[PDB]
Amino acid sequence: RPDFCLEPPYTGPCKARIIRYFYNAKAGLCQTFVYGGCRAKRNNFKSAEDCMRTC
Amino acid sequence: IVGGYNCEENSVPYQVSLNSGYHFCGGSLINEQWVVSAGHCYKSRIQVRLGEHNIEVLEGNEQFINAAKIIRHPQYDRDTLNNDIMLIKLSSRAVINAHVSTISLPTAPPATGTKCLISGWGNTASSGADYPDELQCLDAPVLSQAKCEASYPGKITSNMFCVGFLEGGKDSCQGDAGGPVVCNGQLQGVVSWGDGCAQKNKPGVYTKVYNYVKWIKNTIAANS
Numbered sequence: 001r002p003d004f005c006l007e008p009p010y011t012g013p014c015k016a017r018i019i020r021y022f023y024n025a026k027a028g029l030c031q032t033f034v035y036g037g038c039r040a041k042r043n044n045f046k047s048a049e050d051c052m053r054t055c
Numbered sequence: 056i057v058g059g060y061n062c063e064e065n066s067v068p069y070q071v072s073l074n075s076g077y078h079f080c081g082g083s084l085i086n087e088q089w090v091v092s093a094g095h096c097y098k099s100r101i102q103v104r105l106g107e108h109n110i111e112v113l114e115g116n117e118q119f120i121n122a123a124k125i126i127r128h129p130q131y132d133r134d135t136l137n138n139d140i141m142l143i144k145l146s147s148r149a150v151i152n153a154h155v156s157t158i159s160l161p162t163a164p165p166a167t168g169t170k171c172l173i174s175g176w177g178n179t180a181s182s183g184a185d186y187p188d189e190l191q192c193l194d195a196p197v198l199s200q201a202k203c204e205a206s207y208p209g210k211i212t213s214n215m216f217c218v219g220f221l222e223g224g225k226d227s228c229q230g231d232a233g234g235p236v237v238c239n240g241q242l243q244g245v246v247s248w249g250d251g252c253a254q255k256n257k258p259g260v261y262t263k264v265y266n267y268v269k270w271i272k273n274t275i276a277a278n279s
């Protein structure tokens with residue numbers, strides 16, 4: 001599990017509502033959150049499958 | 056829209072929802088075939104939903120029209136959000152009726168103190184997530200450039216302005232980008248960005264539509 005998989009999800013300052021995936025470390029699974037549209041951190045995946053693969 | 060109220064059914068007939076399988080941004084109908092939205096709302100395929108009020112329910116007034124062209128400002132900057140504007144040409148004309156109509160382009164820049172209406176289906180909570188079905192409205196004033204700059208030092212270009220309240224509690228939020236800021240019947244802004252939603256000393260930053268008038272005229276012309 002890369003260490004970036006431990007970051008909390010990061011919405012960023014933009015105000016879109018883009019459904020993205022993030023690894024929730026405690027819960028041990030890929031979960032949905034709201035991504036604002038700019039300034040993505042790496043714990044931010046475009047599908048569950050990508051998220052599950054990396055993290 | 057944090058700290059807003061349900062807009063009356065179809066009282067913002069120019070408001071659109073952009074949809075990629077779900078509502079992701081707003082926009083403004085500025086003519087029968089063109090919608091203005093923000094640059095960071097870009098995607099290669101977008102369905103434009105007009106005459107919506109409740110985005111969960113087919114009421115019977117909605118027109119669902121595919122985006123035939125999607126033209127982000129060519130100097131949109133993803134890092135600074137400068138030139139955060141985008142045009143969408145609809146694949147067919149919108150049928151103008153009482154629930155769908157256009158909003159005029161601004162004829163002068165925003166004027167400080169002017170009371171504007173901001174609308175959207177974005178988060179209504181300043182922390183956590185409370186995304187509404189019903190279109191949300193919010194009355195808010197244009198802030199001076201000094202306040203805007205004090206709030207976001209070094210981050211505001213002459214293409215941005217601030218609308219809201221330094222005391223916090225009322226603001227646009229995630230899911231509102233691309234939607235309108237309307238003052239005395241003119242489209243003065245596009246919901247663009249901010250540090251959180253509705254936080255003290257952090258009003259929303261909005262793209263200054265007046266600055267893009269020519270670009271909009273020309274892009275329309277070149278794609279007519």
Ligand SMILES: [Ca+2]
Pocket residue numbers: 107108109110111112113114117
């Ligand atoms: Ca509806």
